[PDB]
Structures are given as C-alpha cells and as structure tokens.
C-alpha cells in the first residue's frame, strides 16, 4: 500500500548509508585513516596519499549531491502534481477522466502521511447494463425529433428517452425533444409519436 | 530578418459578429517518446580490460560500481514501468467485431491487418519502417559477433567493451495488441470504457455525442453524416501520405535513439585516452613497469574511466527523467483524450 | 592479451603489423613464424541473473544467462569455463532458450498467465506444480470480443461508489553536510590541503540549502492552500 | 539507533519547518471546509 513513500524514505537512508561507508574505502591509498597516514609516512608521500584520499572523498560527496539534486527534482514534480490534485479535486470537481479516480469523480479527501499526502478519491461507477434498441431521431410528423438531452431507447415495443449514465425512461414529449429538419436525410430515423402536454 | 508572419488587421465593430457557416474535420498527428533503451554496463570489463591485477586494484575503490549497476537497474525497471503504464491501461484485451461498417467511417488504415504476419495496421507499419532503430537485444551468439562484418561492427564493439542493451519486457506484438484493444473499445464503446467495462454504442451516435460536447448540436452530425464520413476518410488517407512523404515527421523518436547511440558510442571512444598514463592498455602498463609506478598509472587510469562512467550514468539519469515526464504526459493524453473527450484547448 | 584467435581474411599492408578499432585496442596481429594475419576476439561472456521465489517459500532457483545461446552455456562447466561455482545447471535437461538469453532451471509451459518475475521479450517465470519453476509467455488478459451493433445501446441501470486511495510523495528529508569534518575530522594539515580546492565545499553547502528550502516550499504549497483554519461543528 | 552513528562524520538532518501537528491542522481545516462548504471555498470565502 504505502510503497510510494516507503521507497522515498528507504532511498534517502540508503544513500546516507553508502556515503558513510565510503569513509572506509582506500582509493588506492595505503589506509583510510588520516592520522595513521600522517604518523607513518614522510610529508612528501603522505602528501600524495592524502591527495588521492581527498579526491576520492570529495568526488563521493559530489556524486551524492548530484543524485540528491535529481531526486529533489522528481519529488518537486510529484509535489506539483499533488498541489494540482488538491486544488482541482479537493476544492472542486474534476472533469478530466482518470485524473481523480477510475470513473466519474465526485469528491476527494486529503490525509497527511509522513513525507507525503494520501487522497481518497470518491468516484462514481456504473455497474449493471441492459441492452436496448436505439434510434438517432424520431420522425413524428415529417420533421425529425432529436432528444433534447438523452438517448432514444425502446423496451421492445415502446420508445423512451433516457439519460445516458443511468437508465431512467420518460415518455416522449415536446420538452424532451427538439426538432430540426425533416425525416428524409438522416438514416435510422424511426416512426413514433411525441405526446403534446 | 525573420518574418513573424503576414500582417493582418482584424476588424472590431461593436455590432459585428462573424459566425461560421461550414466546418472541416481534420486529423493531425502528435508524436511522443515513451521509453528509451534499457542499457546495462559491465563495470569491470569496461573499466578493467580483461585483466587480473587491475581488477584486484579495483576491489579497493569502494561501492562505486555496485551503485552504478543499481542506478542503471532502476532506470531499466523505470522504462518498463513507463511502457506498461502508458499502454496497458485496459484490463481485458477486447478485439474488433468482424463487420467494419461504422456508419460510413473507414478505419481500415488504423484497425489491424490480418494479411500481414506482423499483426499491425498499415499506418503502424509505415512509421515503424520509417524509424531506423539500432539493434536492441538480439541473441548475438558468439558466432554472429566473430568475423569481419561491417554494419554489425558498432554493436559488436559495444559488446566487446562489455556495454550492452536489454530487450524490452513487452514485445512489439504485445504492444500492438494493447493498442488494438484500445482501438476496438474506443470504436465500439467510446469513452464509456474508461469508467468500467466497455458499453456498446453505434459509432454515429458516439460522434453525435462528441459533437454535442463542443457546443454544436447533434443535427449537424445526423443531417450531414455522409459528408463528414468522406471528410474523415480523406483526412486519414492524407495522414498516410504526409507521413510517407517527409522522413522528418517523427524526428523525436529518432532523436531519442540517436542520443542513446551517441551517448554509448562516446563511451567506446573514451578508452582511447591515456588520461596522462603511459598508454591506454592495462596489459602493457603491467608488463613494462614495476609494481610501484605501474600501480600509480593504473590508479590514474581507473579514476579516469570511473569518472567517464559516472558522467555517462548521470546524463542517463537526466535523460530518463525527461523521458518519464514525456511518458506521464502521454499517459494523461491517452486517458483524457483517447478514453474521453477533452475540454482543454490545444 | 587474452581472447580467441581467428583466421583473419583481411590484408595488412607490407609494413604495418597490427590493426585497431574505435577504442585503441588491438583487433588483429600478423603472427610471426607464419606471417599469417591473426584476429582477436574476447572470450564469450555476459551477465547472469537469478530467478528465485522468496527464500521463505522455496530454496530451489532458476538461473538466466543473458545474451548467450543455449549451446556454449552448458558446455561451460564450472570445472574450467563457468567461473561461478554452478555445476548442476551446466548439465540440466531443462535448458530453454529465449530472446534474452539462455536460461536454466525452468520448464517451458504452453499456457499463459499474468506473471510476476519478468524475464524479457515476453517470457516471465513463476512457481507452480511436484512443484518447480515454470517459464511461459505472459498473458495480456482474457481475449474478449465486445459486441458491436448499429442499433443496440447498453445503458447502466445501477451504480456504485468506489473510494480508491492515491499516495503521492511531497517532500524528502532535508539533509546537510559538513564538508571539512566529513572529509577529515580534526586534522589541521588536512584542512590546509583541503581549502586549496576552492569553492567546492561552499558549492555543496549552497546546493543542499537550496534543496532544503525547496522542501519547505513543497510542503507549504501542497498543504497550506487554506486561508484560515476551520473547525468542524460540534454536532 | 543508526541515526546517531551517521550523525557523526558530519551529516546533519534538519527538521522540517512544519511539524506534524501543524500539517494535521492544515488537513483538518481543509476537511472541515470541504465538508460544510464544498467547492465554494477555493474561490474567496468559505
Ligand atoms: C447484450 O447483447 C450481447 C450480445 O452477445 C450479449 O452478450 C449480452 O449478454 C447482452 N446483454 C445482456 C444484459 O444480456
Ligand atoms: C415496455 O414499457 C411499457 C410501458 O408502458 C410496458 O407497458 C411494457 O410492458 C414494457 N415491455 C414491453 C415488452 O413492452
Ligand atoms: C414512416 O411513416 C411515413 C409516413 O408517416 C411513411 O411514408 C414511411 O414509409 C414510414 N417508414 C417507416 C420505416 O416506418
Ligand atoms: C462545406 O464545405 C465543403 C467543402 O469540403 C463543401 O463540399 C460543402 O458543400 C459545404 N457545405 C455548405 C453547406 O456550404
Ligand atoms: C476503406 O479504405 C480502404 C483503403 O482505401 C479500402 O478498403 C476502401 O477504399 C474503403 N472500404 C470501406 C469498406 O470503407
Ligand atoms: C621461424 O621458424 C619457421 C619454421 O618454419 C620459419 O619458417 C621462419 O622463417 C622462422 N623465423 C625466423 C625469423 O627465422
Ligand atoms: C543457437 O545456436 C544454434 C546453433 O546451431 C542456432 O541454430 C540457433 O539459431 C541459435 N539460437 C537462436 C535463437 O538463433
Ligand atoms: C447495420 O449494419 C447492417 C449490416 O452491415 C446493415 O445492413 C444495416 O443497414 C445497418 N443499419 C442500418 C442503417 O439499418
Ligand atoms: C443496485 O445495486 C445495489 C448495490 O450496489 C443493490 O443493493 C440494489 O439492489 C441494486 N438495485 C437497485 C434498484 O438499486
């Protein structure tokens, strides 16, 4: 579950552990303790031994710092992503798919984890389907009849105009249905009535 | 001097509105890199050319080499993650229905081709052939590398130096199957399968709802169905022609491949630098010098080559971050665009 | 040098003896006593890689030899050629070749399952049944055929309310290093020699301070988007 | 702990400016507003 923060912590700890362990490395030099080098060699050669050791250790610090720069850049990308997620989904309702949850989005709740943030995207998912016979327009009186908002479906014999994301049939009336043109150009136009209130 | 563009004078008038009276569908491509090539470097065959004393001397330089290997492994697994999260969003591989009559729209250019042994649509075949990819993980038995070959010389030299590439986890056929599942679902179901399984819907109805989602009612779709179908078909054919004509259409992917090839090949050239040593061959250094000076030169050369490897790794890390940003962008595009309809301009 | 010697078909000009390549390594040589032009090629090699279920579960294991074919891999027994002390695998009967390289210790299965230990080029191993390691091409999923028709729609009659977590990192630990004490603790001569390298320590100090303040800004701009703290009502 | 050991050799770990109680208070404010106000409190008042 929490792998995406556990890895942050473990990578930081591992980098520091490697940086510490580098102290024992010799880098070709006779030993990795400077006092022994000073108290066992003459200054001219103690000089070069220390030179090599300093170069190695400084280069180790340098690579540590560069790796940290790159990790910080990637974490800043994730922090910009988290800021956008909190703004767009905690403080609103997002309209872009798969940004704030698999499915249609309703809300979101933040929870503060150590070195991170956790969101609880409360989404909406349709479950149970039922096939139907659908027709783009209904030619009542020669004129076509597009559904004002919804799809045309037929439970076999009768036609209803339901919404698209939750089956809920209503009888056809002039308020579900707007008209534009005539039933001579569109294909799949059908013949039905449109009750007038 | 650079011309920004043809000067124009848009006309303002507080009782003048220009309402268009005719549209024009248009299909326009958009290339994106997703995954680079998974390299992996052998520390002690590059740094320490097939020698014995040198390797022992390397054994006292700390954990530089295991750290390098660990970083490159992280990059490789990251690349496989990128590919898997961009393409394999669909849980269950759908497949196209036998009939291909989608209200008049012609998908033959994008839907798969049963004739070819490579089960890819013609457009995929075109851009595929266009991208001149260098070898990425053949078997390369000792025999194919041994010889006086000419074109394979580059990969052979890289392998001889120990530098090598690893095959991507998902073969190109599995990638093709993923893209075909995305296509079949988005054709017969629409955006509906981004919120669960795929809900079937006749394609003209889906285009009617796409239309209704940009402020134009649906009658300008149902009343002009054949005209829009012809515009769509022509547009797709044009895309095919335009891709075929200019080889620079997809220069981004070629840029990725070439950047990797250059980056790794510089590495092979780096070994021809003495670094202030007697020569660039360890064996000669060991075979002409006494241990005291020999070791000193060996330390000088090992530090040089370890520094070169460190630079290579670092720049690989940077480039992998850029590719991961592009792959996150492509994952967001395949979500908000392929699996839905986007309201974000441009 | 070491390697394998080959009858080079190439022709040297009468005065130069041996060739080279991109890296200045020798790639040919005119053999004395025979005046024959000889090639050089490194003895075949390649990384190995181990495929193990968790030790808590099993102790048997399969080994992947990357790149190499399944011909020289068994021939290379540990006694002479195979450097690692892995003698049983150099003789196993379960040798199977994939595009990644010769692997030993798994039985190829003609089935297909969603897998856990990726190998490469489609193959990926696992543990299954009298129970050992398999190696099979992965399965993308249950190949479905969604029913298209040009007059049939599917309208959902029932919903559900998922709630799915999503975990994002925000900040990292704000380390900081002490250059001189790290490199050499309390050695005044070493400090003298160390100051001679210029602005390295200052540069590291500056970079790490930049990272730390960036962390503080990260947390501040991720969480502190609220004008004033609010209270939940009593009821 | 190992932290003391790595503390020597001069590798300090500075604390984060925001303590976990402060961060928890931030998220508590967010939750209370988003529960009794909705989206309204991203735009000006609550
Ligand atoms: C809808 O038709 C398809 C066509 O085969 C069928 O598989 C499916 O079961 C039908 N829907 C229902 C709810 O039965
Ligand atoms: C369809 O809906 C109508 C609504 O009046 C109902 O009377 C009828 O029983 C339903 N089923 C069929 C098969 O017509
Ligand atoms: C629909 O009705 C019109 C007249 O009302 C008739 O001319 C036409 O043939 C009918 N078509 C169908 C498909 O019922
Ligand atoms: C719209 O433009 C197209 C050009 O492709 C033309 O064929 C068509 O007749 C135009 N329609 C109208 C109503 O002008
Ligand atoms: C679709 O386009 C292809 C390529 O030209 C060809 O089969 C034909 O022109 C079209 N066929 C159908 C059925 O649309
Ligand atoms: C070395 O011995 C071979 C034996 O056949 C002979 O051909 C060759 O000339 C000899 N080389 C020299 C330099 O004498
Ligand atoms: C492995 O070597 C044999 C040698 O006869 C060859 O036939 C085979 O093709 C090689 N493997 C591959 C995958 O090519
Ligand atoms: C649906 O597809 C069938 C088979 O291609 C076709 O005969 C029929 O005309 C299509 N729908 C319409 C327009 O009635
Ligand atoms: C809808 O689904 C719920 C479970 O999500 C179930 O309890 C209920 O009986 C189903 N039918 C209706 C009409 O709500």
- Residue C87 to residue C79: CA distance in whole angstroms: 8
SS3 state of residue B144? helix
CB C48 within 8 A of CB C64: yes
- Residue B190 to residue C198: CA distance in whole angstroms: 63
- Residue B330 to residue C173: CA distance in whole angstroms: 30
Enter the resolution in angstroms: 3.4
| Residue B101 Cβ < 6 Å to ligand 8 | yes
How close C182 comes to chain D (CA, Å)?
Answer: 5
- Residue B96 to residue A161: CA distance in whole angstroms: 29
What is the number of alpha carbons within 13 Å of residue B328 lying toward its C-beta? 11
- Interface with A, mutate which of C154, C166, C192 (most A CBs under 10 A): C166
Q: Does D22 touch chain A (CB under 8 A)?
A: no
CA proximity to A2, closest of A121, A124, A111, A123: A111
Helix (H) or strand (E) holding A49: helix A43-85
**Main-chain dihedrals φ then ψ at residue B314, nearest 5 degrees:** -45, -50
CB C102 within 8 A of CB C69: yes
Q: What sign has the CA pseudo-torsion C101, C103, C109, C111?
A: negative
CB C188 within 8 A of CB A161: no
- Residue B36 to residue B259: CA distance in whole angstroms: 10
Task: Kindly write down the DSSP assignment for every residue of chain C, as one continuous string.
Answer: --SEEEE------SS------SSS---EEEETTTTEEEEEEPPP---EEEE---TTT----EEEE-S--TTHHHHS-TTTT--SS--SGGG-S--EEETTEEEES-EE-SS----SEEEETTEEEEEE---EEEEEE------------SSEEEEEEEEE--EEEEEEE----EEEE-HHHHHSTT-HHHHHHHGGG-SHHHHHHHHHHHHHHHHHHHHHHHH---SS-------
- Residue B273 to residue B277: CA distance in whole angstroms: 9
Ligand 2 center–CA A158 separation, angstroms: 6
**Residues after which chain D has a gap (C–N > 2.5 Å):** none
The protein residue with its alpha carbon nearest to ligand 1, atom 6, reads: C147
Query: Using alpha carbons only, what angle is made at residue B58 by residues B56 and B63, rounded to the nearest 5 degrees?
Result: 125
CA proximity to C21, closest of C7, C32, C10: C10
Residue found under tokens 């402020």: B215
CA proximity to C45, closest of B42, B168, B59: B42
- Chain-chain contact of A99 with B194 (C-beta, under 8 angstroms): no
Q: Do chains C and B touch (3 or more CB pairs under 8 A)?
A: yes
CB C200 within 8 A of CB D3: no
CA proximity to A70, closest of B71, B76, C220: B71
CB C189 within 8 A of CB A49: no
Nearest atom (ligand 5) to Cα of B101: 13
CB C144 within 8 A of CB B94: yes
- Chain-chain contact of C166 with A75 (C-beta, under 8 angstroms): no
- Chain-chain contact of B314 with A77 (C-beta, under 8 angstroms): no
Q: Compute the radius of gyration of chain C from its Cα atoms.
A: 32
| Angle subtended by helix axes A43-85 and B291-333, to nearest 10 | 10
Interface of C with A in 152-181 (CB under 8 A): 152-173, 175, 177, 179
CB pairs under 8 A between C and D: 68
Q: Does A150 touch chain B (CB under 8 A)?
A: no
| Residue B98 Cβ < 6 Å to ligand 8 | no
CB A123 within 8 A of CB A98: no
| Residue B315 Cβ < 6 Å to ligand 5 | no
- Residue A83 to residue A85: CA distance in whole angstroms: 5
SS3 state of residue B345? coil
On chain A, the residues whose CB falls within 8 A of the CB of D1 are: none
Residue found under tokens 């327009």: A137
Q: How was this structure determined?
A: cryo-EM
CA proximity to A111, closest of A120, A103, A102: A120
How far is the CA of A93 from the CAs of D31, D34, D42, in angstroms? 15, 11, 11
- Chain-chain contact of D30 with C226 (C-beta, under 8 angstroms): yes
SS (H, E, C) B190-210: HHHHHHCCCCCCCHHHHHHHH
- Residue A122 to residue A166: CA distance in whole angstroms: 18
- Chain-chain contact of C121 with B88 (C-beta, under 8 angstroms): no
Q: Which residues contact C135 (CB under 8 A, 6 or more apart)?
A: C62, C96, C98, C103, C106, C107, C108, C109, C119, C123, C124, C125
Separation of CA B301 from chain center: 36
- Chain-chain contact of D39 with A23 (C-beta, under 8 angstroms): no
| Residue C157 Cβ < 6 Å to ligand 9 | no
Which chains sit next to D, with 3 or more Cβ pairs under 8 A? A, C
| Residue A18 Cβ < 6 Å to ligand 2 | no
Task: Kindly write down the DSSP assignment for every residue of B162-187, as one continuous string.
Answer: T-EEE--SS-HHHHHHHHHHHHHHHH
| Residue B150 Cβ < 6 Å to ligand 8 | no
Tokens of B174: 């599995």
Tokens of C6: 């080959």
The protein residue with its alpha carbon nearest to ligand 9, atom 1, reads: C158
E strands, chain B, are: 38-40, 164-166
Give the number of other CB atoms < 10 A from CB of residue C121.
21
Q: How many residues in chain D?
A: 46
Contacts for B284-291 with beta carbons within 8 Å, 24 or more apart?
Answer: B286/B51, B286/B53, B286/B54
Nearest atom (ligand 7) to Cα of C97: 13
| Residue B240 Cβ < 6 Å to ligand 5 | no
SS3 state of residue B18? coil
How close A163 comes to chain C (CA, Å)?
Answer: 9
- Residue C89 to residue C103: CA distance in whole angstroms: 9
Interface of A with C in 1-60 (CB under 8 A): 1-2, 4-5, 8-9, 12, 16, 34-35, 38, 47, 50-51, 54, 57-58
| Residue B132 Cβ < 6 Å to ligand 5 | no
- Chain-chain contact of C216 with D9 (C-beta, under 8 angstroms): no
Give the number of other CB atoms < 10 A from CB of residue B126.
17
How far is the CA of B223 from the CAs of B102, B204, B218, in angstroms? 16, 11, 8
Contacts for C207-214 with beta carbons within 8 Å, 24 or more apart?
Answer: C207/A65, C207/A68, C207/A69, C208/A65, C208/A68, C208/C175, C208/C176, C208/C177, C209/C176, C211/A68, C211/A69, C211/A72, C211/C174, C212/C174, C212/C175, C212/C176, C212/D14, C214/A72, C214/A76
**Main-chain dihedrals φ then ψ at residue C220, nearest 5 degrees:** -65, -40
- Residue C143 to residue B180: CA distance in whole angstroms: 12
CA proximity to B187, closest of B214, B158, B212, B207: B207
Interface of A with B in 78-97 (CB under 8 A): 95-97
CB A159 within 8 A of CB A192: yes
Q: Does C85 touch chain A (CB under 8 A)?
A: no
Helix (H) or strand (E) holding B239: helix B225-245
Task: Kindly write down the DSSP assignment for every residue of A64-124, as one continuous string.
Answer: HHHHHHHHHHHHHHHHHHHHHHIIIIISS---STTTSSSSEEEE--EE--TTEEEEEEEEE
Q: Does C212 touch chain A (CB under 8 A)?
A: no
Q: What sign has the CA pseudo-torsion C190, C195, C198, C199?
A: positive
- Chain-chain contact of D11 with C174 (C-beta, under 8 angstroms): no
Which one-letter DSSP state was computed for residue D39? S
- Interface with C, mutate which of B78, B102, B136, B141 (most C CBs under 10 A): B141
Please report which ligand is nearest the Cα atom of A132. 1
């Amino acid at each position: 579950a929490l792998g995406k923060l556990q890895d942050v912590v473990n990578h930081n700890a591992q980098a520091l552990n490697t940086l510490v362990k580098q102290l024992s490395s010799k880098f070709g030099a006779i030993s990795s303790v400077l006092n022994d080098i000073f108290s066992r060699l003459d200054p001219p050669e103690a000089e070069v031994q220390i030179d090599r050791l300093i170069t190695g250790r400084l280069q180790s610090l340098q690579t540590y710092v560069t790796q940290q720069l790159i990790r910080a850049a990637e974490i800043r990308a994730s922090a910009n992503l988290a800021a956008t997620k909190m703004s767009e989904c905690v403080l609103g309702q997002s309209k872009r798919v798969d940004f704030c949850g698999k499915g249609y989005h309703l809300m979101s709740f933040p929870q503060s984890a150590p070195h991170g943030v956790v969101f609880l995207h409360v989404t909406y998912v349709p479950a149970q389907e039922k096939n139907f016979t659908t027709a783009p327009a209904i030619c009542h009186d020669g004129k076509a009849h597009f559904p004002r908002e919804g799809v045309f479906v037929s439970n076999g014999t009768h036609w209803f105009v339901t919404q698209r994301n939750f089956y809920e049939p209503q009888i056809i009336t002039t308020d579900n249905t707007f008209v534009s043109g005539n039933c001579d150009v569109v294909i799949g136009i059908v013949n039905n009535t449109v009750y007038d209130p | 001097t650079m011309s920004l563009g043809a000067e124009n004078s848009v006309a303002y008038s507080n009782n003048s509105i220009a309402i268009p009276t005719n549209f024009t569908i248009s299909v326009t491509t958009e290339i994106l890199p997703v995954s680079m090539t998974k390299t992996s470097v052998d520390c002690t065959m590059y740094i320490c050319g097939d020698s014995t004393e040198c390797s022992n001397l390397l054994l006292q330089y700390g954990s530089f080499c295991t750290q390098l290997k660990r970083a490159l492994t992280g990059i490789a697994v990251e690349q496989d993650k990128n590919t898997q999260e961009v393409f394999a969003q669909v849980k269950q591989i759908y497949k196209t229905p036998p009939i291909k009559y989608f209200g008049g729209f012609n998908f033959s250019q994008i839907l798969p081709d049963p004739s070819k042994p490579s089960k890819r649509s013609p457009i995929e075949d075109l851009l595929f052939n266009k991208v001149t990819l260098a070898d990425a993980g053949f078997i390369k038995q000792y025999g194919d590398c041994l010889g006086d070959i000419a074109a394979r010389d580059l990969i052979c030299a890289q392998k001889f130096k120990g530098l090598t590439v690893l095959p991507p986890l998902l073969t190109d056929e599995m990638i093709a199957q993923y893209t075909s599942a995305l296509l079949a679902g988005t054709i017969t179901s629409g955006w509906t399968f981004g919120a669960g399984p795929a809900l079937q819907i006749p394609f003209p109805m889906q285009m009617a709802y796409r239309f209704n989602g940009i402020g134009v009612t649906q009658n300008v779709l149902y009343e002009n169905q054949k005209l829009i179908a012809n515009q769509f078909n022509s547009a797709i054919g044009k895309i095919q022609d335009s891709l075929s004509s200019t080889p620079s259409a997809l220069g981004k992917l070629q840029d990725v491949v070439n950047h990797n090839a250059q980056a790794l090949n510089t590495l092979v050239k780096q070994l021809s630098s003495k670094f202030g040593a007697i020569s660039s061959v360890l064996n000669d250094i060991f075979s002409r010098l006494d241990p005291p000076e020999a070791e000193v030169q060996i330390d000088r050369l090992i530090t040089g080559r370890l520094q070169s490897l460190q630079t290579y790794v670092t720049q690989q890390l940077i480039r992998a971050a850029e590719i991961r940003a592009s792959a996150n962008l492509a994952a967001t595009k395949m979500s908000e665009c392929v699996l839905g309809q986007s309201k974000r301009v441009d | 040098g070491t390697g394998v010697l080959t009858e080079s078909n190439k022709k040297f000009l009468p005065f130069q003896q041996f060739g080279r390549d991109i890296a200045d390594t020798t790639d040919a040589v005119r053999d004395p006593q025979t005046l024959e032009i000889l090639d050089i090629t490194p003895c075949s090699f390649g990384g190995v890689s181990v495929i193990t279920p968790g030790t808590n579960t099993s102790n048997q294991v399969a080994v992947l030899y990357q790149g190499v074919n399944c011909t020289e891999v068994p021939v290379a027994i540990h006694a002479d050629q195979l450097t690692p002390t892995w003698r049983v695998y150099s003789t196993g009967s379960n040798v199977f070749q994939t595009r990644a390289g010769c692997l030993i210790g798994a039985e190829y299965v003609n089935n297909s399952y969603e897998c856990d230990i990726p190998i490469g080029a489609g193959i990926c191993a696992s543990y299954q049944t009298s129970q050992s390691i398999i190696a099979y091409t992965m399965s993308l999923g249950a190949e479905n055929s969604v029913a298209y028709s040009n007059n049939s729609i599917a309208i959902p009659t029932n919903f559900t309310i998922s709630v799915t977590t999503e975990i994002l990192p925000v900040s990292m630990t704000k380390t900081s290093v002490d250059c001189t004490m790290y490199i050499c603790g309390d050695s005044t001569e070493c400090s003298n020699l160390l100051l001679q390298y210029g602005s390295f320590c200052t540069q590291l100090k500056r970079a790490l301070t930049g990272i730390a303040v960036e962390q503080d800004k990260n947390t501040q701009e991720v969480f502190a988007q609220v004008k004033q703290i609010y209270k939940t009502p009593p009821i």
